[PDB]
Write a protein that binds this ligand. Structure first.
Ligand SMILES: CC(=O)N[C@@H](C)C(=S)N1C[C@H](O)C[C@H]1C(=O)NCc1ccc(-c2scnc2C)cc1
Lengths: 141, 104, 87
């Protein structure tokens, strides 16, 4: 369902990482499979060649935490007006306190020891249910 | 520009915001509405320094880039019990436990 | 504005805007003007209050959003509180 449209109409784009994370750009190819692209360090930019109707999303390269691009989930290159590039502003969302807490606990505790943490079992599952692109593609569909 | 504050006395902590251009006196009026004690019965502090009513929060070092939403700047508060002013006293928050072995 | 008092397990009284506290569904239920938290210490509940300010300042905003900071020492307890408070 969620896939790039094979338009073959070039669209120049600036991926602008305005977040403190290392960014993984993910292109949804013509069969809906996620293709990872090279990473962007925090505060950096890349001028890239894409196409009209192509689908992109953006994650933390280390943890796969979701990021926003122009205030939303998916970015789709549009028509270049006056020959100028389309800007893809990649930012942090306002994470819930719960999910932000989960991020920090995941960054400190290795996956083997989530069970050893003295917490209710549902939080143990919330920790193990770590951010994943395949899950959000089912959610977005 | 908004500045984000914790106004603190004893075991009391007010989370609020104010303009950088607003005065110390105007902050006492905010405290008055919340804690029902007028400005004349209040002393406001940055660390150990007593703040003058006429000065802006910006003049007293509360700027939008230091006094942030996620990490607000602390303003000390002391009341006058009838005759004289009490000493500035801010009870510290509780101590975190040791990091468990799994996090350590 | 209208304020509410959130009281930690160790007796610290945190006074925040009603709107800010109503971000938590649990707190809304507990209010429907003071709430006592028997399990949330002050070093956790202060951070909870700072999160309210952060969320209200940065929800629906073009200006670049900073990371909400959480020290390793308080992360586990803050997680438990966030799960209880649903925020
Ligand atoms: C026929 C077709 O459309 N093929 C796909 C595989 C192509 S050529 N794509 C898909 C996307 O629309 C982007 C485009 C592409 O791969 N462009 C080359 C490219 C190379 C590196 C990068 C990136 S992403 C972060 N850093 C770089 C250097 C971006 C685009």
């Amino acid at each position: 369902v969620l896939r790039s449209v094979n338009s073959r109409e070039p669209s120049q784009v600036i991926f602008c990482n305005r977040s403190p994370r290392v960014v993984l750009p993910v292109w949804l190819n013509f069969d809906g499979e996620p293709q990872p692209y090279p990473t962007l360090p925090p505060g950096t930019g890349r001028r890239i060649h894409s196409y009209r109707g192509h689908l992109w999303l953006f994650r933390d390269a280390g943890t796969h935490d979701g990021l926003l691009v122009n205030q939303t989930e998916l970015f789709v290159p549009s028509l270049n007006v006056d020959g100028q590039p389309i800007f893809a502003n990649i930012t942090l969302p306002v994470y819930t306190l719960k999910e932000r807490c989960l991020q920090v606990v995941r960054s400190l505790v290795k996956p083997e020891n989530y069970r050893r943490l003295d917490i209710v079992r549902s939080l143990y599952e919330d920790l193990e249910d770590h951010p994943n692109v395949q899950k959000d593609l089912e959610r977005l569909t | 520009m908004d500045v984000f504050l914790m106004i603190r006395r004893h075991k009391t902590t007010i989370f609020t915001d104010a303009k950088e251009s607003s005065t110390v006196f105007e902050l006492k009026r905010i405290v008055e509405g919340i804690l029902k004690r007028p400005p004349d019965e209040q002393r406001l502090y940055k660390d150990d320094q007593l703040l003058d009513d006429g000065k802006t929060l910006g003049e007293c070092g509360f700027t939008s880039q230091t006094a942030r939403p996620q990490a607000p700047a602390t303003v000390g508060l002391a009341f006058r019990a009838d005759d004289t002013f009490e000493a500035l006293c801010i009870e510290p928050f509780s101590s975190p436990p040791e990091l468990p072995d799994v996090m350590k | 504005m209208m304020y509410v008092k959130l009281i930690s397990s160790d007796g610290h009284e945190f006074i925040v805007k009603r709107e800010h506290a109503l971000t938590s569904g649990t707190i809304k239920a507990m209010l429907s003007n003071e709430v006592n938290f028997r399990e949330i210490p002050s070093h956790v509940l202060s951070k909870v209050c700072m999160y309210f300010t952060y969320k209200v300042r940065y929800t629906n905003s073009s200006t670049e959003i900073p990371e909400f900071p959480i020290a390793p020492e308080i992360a586990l307890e803050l997680l438990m509180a966030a799960n209880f408070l649903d925020c």
